[model samples]
Target: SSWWSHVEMGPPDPILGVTEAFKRDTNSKKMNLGVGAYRDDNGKPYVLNCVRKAEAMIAAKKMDKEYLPIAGLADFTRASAELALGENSEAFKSGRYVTVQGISGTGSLRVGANFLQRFFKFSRDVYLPKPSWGNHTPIFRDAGLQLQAYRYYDPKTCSLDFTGAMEDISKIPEKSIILLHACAHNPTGVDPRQEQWKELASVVKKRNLLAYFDMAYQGFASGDINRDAWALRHFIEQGIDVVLSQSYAKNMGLYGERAGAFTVICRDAEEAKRVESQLKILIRPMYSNPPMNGARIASLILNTPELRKEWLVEVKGMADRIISMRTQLVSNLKKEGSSHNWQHITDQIGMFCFTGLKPEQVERLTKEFSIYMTKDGRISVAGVASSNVGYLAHAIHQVTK
Candidate 1:
């Protein structure tokens, strides 16, 4: 028997597989709107001017490729904290955080999940939004967790099911791990308001649930990073101990670099020190240490005064572009005389617009219009370009009408 006789084909990636299938179809006019990465108004992948500026500065200085410590560069993690928690964060002042660099958001999520499985003295049941990023359930499952859903999207309105979601959260067992999209919710771009966030904080406090935030699209949600971070910051400010999974892939254009951080906010300095020690014990067997380049780039932009200013401008520029694309999409749909209220296109803040099209309608768009998206009908607004918005609108009208 051959050595590989028992090898079986694995299932295709739920996210990337769509793109691969889209590529094989020889439709000259085929459009690929799958994948989460941002593209410019020209329908091409974007490398920010700020990133190029940082790269050039780095080249001029000729930085070394030494191995970063197991927890990653202190500056990168510290800067990430400042970026997420605001400049005058109490989290920073309290000395109550344990941070580590992991393989982007997904990797950090896994590491955090592993910690919960091993250490958390609570229920194994994890609560996820009804329509969260598809990968989240599997990640928790592979970590030996039991997954449950909380109400999220209202299919009829294609909007946030806020009441249902709160009800669901209230019903979950105390100390249950609840995953929250820190900002710019994936799939459905709906978010709780600041007042709603306060309500959520009160509920979490009342229920004593463990909150785990996935802050993947922080700066990418609203053009103002601080505004986008309002909910997460408010929760922390309310004295909620939380776990944050941070990624620089969207904001810093570090997609291929796999740059991310996993941070836990403990009660105080004593708890933080204990958490940090165990986190190192977890990291040593996992990957030993993190890659240096991405952390260095992130640290340089975050720590250096001039570079930091430039990075903010560049991040705002990318965010502004996504916002512009949202406007263009909603405008295009209206011009096509879409009877449906397409305001959600502009209303939802993020790189994606949940178009409310059914799975069958999405299939029609792919088959009849040579446009590719997931079965769920979520469109990557980042994939929309100025030139093709009209065509996309027509395709949408065809299915929606």
Candidate 2:
């Protein structure tokens, strides 16, 4: 301990730390609800049929384990651009978008922030939603940016605070960066309405600010890729150039594969090329190249016609299961005789449900019930299996009562 004896000990991650705690418990009925990854109706981690077939195809082709370019696999990035921007989209058809492959959303997000740090030049400040994904703060923090927040969730409604959001966002300095959850907002699971999004786009355009979209769970939200891509496409259509990051982690059940995309909508082909090289130089200095295995696996499904069709089908399948869990959870809460309003449980979409449980109440659930979840009451509904729904409702009711 002589060389670095003064090194400090840091606290655990707010999200991942919950997993650490969950594992330490020896209770027979312990349920892990902290992580937001998908689990089937049987509570097993569900892998997509498309992914399995893609892997089998790669094995058959006997691909080489060579170094990928700094920009990443070609087809993967092209398919990723289309995944975010619709086929009819002007930006997509214009050949004016820049994309790069990176390690999942977290790392790709960091690349976005890093690019901004090096290139944005106008500001060192990035605005975020209040109570965003717990992981968001650290990315910008480590990327040399100051953190500010706009109004997002209203505790009384357990939903979006649009007026408050408009008020805060309107005041952000021109050319500043604002983070947006493209769909299925993290932790809260609340997103803006179509009309509301139009207004936000208009305001962002008027203010001359940059909009950054985090679309980690595209098809995971509405079970439709087209619908999920609406917000980002609308922003581009409204003449607002935006930055978007997508993860195959949620949609493709490629959780461990670490495949993700970072995209920037440029004005023309020239600017797009410039943007590409800009990020290429930045990426080289930070992380030499993107991982080939995940990029190849992700490309096969995203690029191949037959496999892409299969992927969309199963994407909805998982979403349907999550929706079912939401309905069942709300019904059982009523059956459990809890007088609390659980409508938001159904109103929120995708993998998470923000139950509005207090810190002490959350602790009570863990201490007395052997159930695991974040202290903020954000539980991944995907973790709820048909078999354990009864147990969870019973356990949850005990804490509230």
Candidate 3:
């Protein structure tokens, strides 16, 4: 007679759920390398100094707690789009952009997916890279579309399987939705090279497919915003109207603050206005309107030249820290006499290292070493610290040895 008897419990969120499991463990040396959120060398949540400064400025003015417009803040979305497409991008210069504030990357993706599902009915379907961001598959599926995989990671080389992926993309029917990780591909950390992006864009144009980018780790990857957004910008320059979902969680360290934007590129300003109107219609019933504090903070930093400069430096510092950890992790594994090549651990960009750990090895790491991570062997390199690298290496060696 329970009200929920007909329903069932769902599995834990692949990325965020790991934190919960890690917390329940009592082992003193327990390490959590599951979630993508960044941590300092001491393994604690990080808030950039710039965010603090920005917050102070907001508090000084006593920013209002008013509800944002259905599509969210104008400045926040404009800055986000400009950051992705470049200030003078044809898409921006033409004023053919439809942007709305969403909860975060996940929320932005939902809006984009739903938009495609409703208005762009002739589109074939969305194709995600095999072993893409953990949540991508579900996001599309629940939006009432079939999910397909394009080859991405090559396990044998422990690197990007770009060639294989391209081969499959060639076969996809025209007008299908193709998801590209704009920078710092999640879970695997594999990214397409600049030239590769150009080639891919050529095919998408030839086939007339829609490119939807999930840019969750732009600054978190190269620590240079423009450099990180290079692939997407290149495609935009190529005259392809693209859809984007951007998150500021990693770069801004606004994990709980939930700052992000969802954007669409229309053929012209007239079309853009119509798209924006529809986007607002879609968002109004969801969360009504997003919270203002995080967007306000992000707006202040992004708009003011001085605070913006500080934010770039601070986020770059965070990125450099993770890169350093990747270097240290690989070096220590080699020093420990690990027989396998660990270079990919350092070469792969972004916050994660796809350890390629088999399910058994992952289980052993959890049961024996108290190390926690996703079953697919994706480890959040941001969670690695000086104190635990050796232990992590030893555990890894034990499994692979």
User: Pairing residues by index, what is the TM-score of model 2?
Assistant: 0.98
Candidate 1: which pairs clash? none
Model 1 scores a C-alpha lDDT of: 0.85
Who is ahead in TM-score, 2 or 3?
A: 2
How close is each model in CA RMSD to the real structure?
A: 1.8, 1.1, 1.3
How many residue pairs clash in model 2?
A: 0
| lDDT per residue (tens digit) for residues 181-208 in model 3 | 9988877787887888889999988888
Question: TM-score for model 3?
Answer: 0.97
| Model 2 stretches astray by more than 4 angstroms | none
Find the 10 residues in a row with the least total lDDT in model 3.
116-125
lDDT (Cα atoms) of all candidates against the true structure: 0.85, 0.90, 0.86
Error of 3 at 134 (Å): 1.6
Off by over 4 Å in 1: 1-7
Instruction: Kindly indicate the candidate among 1 and 2 with the higher TM-score.
Output: 2
- In candidate 3 the C-alpha lDDT for residue 223 amounts to 85
Cα lDDT tens digits for candidate 2, 13-122: 77889889999999988888998889888998888898888999899999888888899999999989988998788888999999999888998899999999888888
Clashing pairs in 3: none
